[PDB]
Design an enzyme around this catalytic site. Structure first.
Site, short mmCIF file in Angstrom:
data_model
loop_
_atom_site.label_atom_id
_atom_site.label_comp_id
_atom_site.label_asym_id
_atom_site.label_seq_id
_atom_site.Cartn_x
_atom_site.Cartn_y
_atom_site.Cartn_z
N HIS A 61 -34.91 -21.08 39.61
CA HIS A 61 -33.77 -21.13 40.51
C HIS A 61 -33.41 -22.55 40.92
O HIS A 61 -32.25 -22.81 41.25
CB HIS A 61 -34.06 -20.30 41.77
CG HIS A 61 -34.63 -18.94 41.48
ND1 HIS A 61 -33.86 -17.87 41.08
CD2 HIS A 61 -35.91 -18.49 41.50
CE1 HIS A 61 -34.63 -16.82 40.88
NE2 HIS A 61 -35.88 -17.17 41.13
N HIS A 91 -36.58 -29.46 47.21
CA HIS A 91 -35.83 -28.97 46.05
C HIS A 91 -34.36 -29.24 46.32
O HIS A 91 -33.99 -29.71 47.41
CB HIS A 91 -36.07 -27.46 45.87
CG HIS A 91 -35.56 -26.65 47.02
ND1 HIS A 91 -36.33 -26.38 48.13
CD2 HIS A 91 -34.35 -26.08 47.25
CE1 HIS A 91 -35.62 -25.67 48.99
NE2 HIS A 91 -34.41 -25.49 48.49
N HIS A 93 -30.01 -27.96 45.46
CA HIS A 93 -28.97 -27.05 44.99
C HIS A 93 -27.80 -27.92 44.52
O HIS A 93 -27.50 -28.93 45.16
CB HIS A 93 -28.52 -26.12 46.14
CG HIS A 93 -29.65 -25.39 46.81
ND1 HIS A 93 -29.99 -24.09 46.48
CD2 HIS A 93 -30.53 -25.78 47.76
CE1 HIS A 93 -31.02 -23.70 47.22
NE2 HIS A 93 -31.38 -24.72 47.99
N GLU A 103 -24.79 -26.11 49.83
CA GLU A 103 -24.86 -24.81 50.49
C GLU A 103 -24.15 -24.87 51.84
O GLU A 103 -23.19 -24.13 52.08
CB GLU A 103 -26.33 -24.39 50.65
CG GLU A 103 -27.03 -24.28 49.28
CD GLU A 103 -28.16 -23.28 49.27
OE1 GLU A 103 -29.12 -23.45 50.05
OE2 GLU A 103 -28.11 -22.33 48.47
N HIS A 116 -33.13 -30.09 50.15
CA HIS A 116 -33.84 -29.37 51.21
C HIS A 116 -35.30 -29.80 51.23
O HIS A 116 -36.03 -29.58 50.25
CB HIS A 116 -33.74 -27.86 50.99
CG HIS A 116 -32.37 -27.33 51.23
ND1 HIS A 116 -31.93 -26.12 50.73
CD2 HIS A 116 -31.33 -27.85 51.93
CE1 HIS A 116 -30.69 -25.92 51.12
NE2 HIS A 116 -30.30 -26.95 51.85
N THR A 195 -32.19 -19.67 52.32
CA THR A 195 -30.95 -19.42 51.59
C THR A 195 -31.15 -18.74 50.24
O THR A 195 -30.16 -18.52 49.53
CB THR A 195 -30.15 -20.70 51.39
OG1 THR A 195 -30.83 -21.55 50.45
CG2 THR A 195 -29.92 -21.44 52.73
C1 LIG Z 1 -44.70 -16.87 50.68
C2 LIG Z 1 -43.44 -17.65 51.03
C3 LIG Z 1 -43.77 -18.93 51.79
N1 LIG Z 1 -42.71 -17.98 49.82
C4 LIG Z 1 -41.32 -18.30 50.13
C5 LIG Z 1 -40.53 -18.44 48.82
O1 LIG Z 1 -41.20 -19.34 47.99
C6 LIG Z 1 -39.13 -18.98 49.12
O2 LIG Z 1 -39.29 -20.18 49.84
C7 LIG Z 1 -38.10 -20.83 50.22
C8 LIG Z 1 -38.18 -22.02 50.92
C9 LIG Z 1 -37.02 -22.67 51.30
C10 LIG Z 1 -35.78 -22.12 50.96
S1 LIG Z 1 -34.26 -22.98 51.46
N2 LIG Z 1 -33.20 -22.98 50.16
O3 LIG Z 1 -33.69 -22.23 52.56
O4 LIG Z 1 -34.64 -24.33 51.86
C11 LIG Z 1 -35.70 -20.93 50.27
C12 LIG Z 1 -36.87 -20.28 49.89
ZN LIG Z 2 -32.80 -24.75 49.45
#
Ligand SMILES: CC(C)NC[C@H](O)COc1ccc(S(N)(=O)=O)cc1
Ligand SMILES: [Zn+2]
Ligand SMILES: CC(C)NC[C@H](O)COc1ccc(S(N)(=O)=O)cc1
Length: 257
Positions: A61, A91, A93, A103, A116, A195
């Site tokens: 992703h 990471h 986007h 975003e 992010h 997100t």
């Molecule tokens: C077990 C948990 C911590 N795993 C979470 C998964 O990896 C998703 O983690 C994330 C972490 C940050 C974001 S964003 N784009 O809002 O910064 C989205 C998903």
């Molecule tokens: Zn993100």
């Protein structure tokens, strides 16, 4: 499973993650004329001097750089936050064209990409516990515009060839994330969510006002990554952004006049 295509993208996510339609979803449009200056907001404290990067990974992703978060080595404090938040990963986007990819938006303006930096509240002990709490995570968001190159980004760009497809990873030690920040730490802040799925409503969002500039050659290298795994039909990793969600019963606060 979920993704960013026509058949598995943001409009489909609610069917497996019903919190997609919740009361504090991210990202949002930041209406600068409606955001209120809050003089009680303290300056952010970004303490990345002792950061220990570990790996860089194509997760299907986005691509992410992971850090050792077993001690208070790289932490975010201050601002709107109570307590200490440890850096777990960063990471990006980004878009297929320079006029889209972020975003969050600012007065409806989309930037070419968005960085992010993901942190978790140490009072919860581990990130899995933190994502189940309304104040479990803090994400520092930084806009990217196309202009001059960002020298602190180049070491990331130069390794992307080695992680082209989903599942690939490489050693990425001794990376200093301080090279990714703009000069100013002025910010907007609001309560929101992850997100991507699971879309958990556990994030204090801190979005910097000042974008960073990256070169066209740097962003072009983002766009050569693949969503697919090795051997599958090639689908370029572009437009991996969720659009702005309803603000609902929330106020965005500004740290600056
Ligand atoms: C077990 C948990 C911590 N795993 C979470 C998964 O990896 C998703 O983690 C994330 C972490 C940050 C974001 S964003 N784009 O809002 O910064 C989205 C998903
Ligand atoms: Zn993100
Ligand atoms: C075409 C095959 C390989 N893909 C598998 C299947 O279609 C999956 O379809 C979907 C579509 C959307 C989602 S959601 N609500 O997570 O965004 C999950 C599975």
């Amino acid at each position: 499973h979920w993704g960013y295509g026509k058949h598995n993208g943001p409009e489909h996510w609610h069917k497996d993650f019903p919190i997609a339609k919740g009361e504090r979803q991210s990202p949002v449009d930041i209406d600068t004329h409606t955001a209120k200056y809050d003089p009680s907001l303290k300056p952010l404290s970004v303490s990345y001097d002792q950061a220990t990067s570990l790996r860089i990974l194509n997760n299907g992703h986005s691509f992410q750089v992971t850090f050792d978060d077993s001690q208070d080595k790289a932490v975010l404090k201050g601002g709107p936050l109570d307590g200490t938040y440890r850096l777990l990963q960063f990471h990006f986007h980004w878009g297929s064209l320079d006029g889209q990819g972020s975003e969050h938006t600012v007065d409806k303006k989309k930037y070419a990409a968005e960085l992010h930096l993901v942190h978790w509240n140490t009072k919860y002990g581990d990130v899995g516990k933190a994502v189940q709490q309304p104040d479990g995570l803090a994400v520092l968001g930084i806009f990217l515009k196309v202009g001059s190159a960002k020298p602190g980004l180049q070491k990331v760009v130069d390794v992307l060839d080695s992680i082209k497809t989903e599942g690939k990873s490489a050693d990425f030690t001794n990376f200093d994330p301080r090279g990714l920040l703009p000069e100013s730490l002025d910010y907007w802040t609001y309560p929101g969510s992850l997100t991507t799925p699971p879309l958990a409503e556990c994030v204090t969002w801190i979005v910097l006002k000042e974008p960073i500039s990256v070169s066209s050659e740097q962003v072009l290298k983002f766009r050569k990554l693949n969503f697919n795994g090795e051997g599958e039909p090639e689908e370029l990793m572009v437009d991996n952004w969720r659009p702005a969600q309803p603000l609902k019963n929330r106020q965005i606060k500004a740290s600056f006049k």
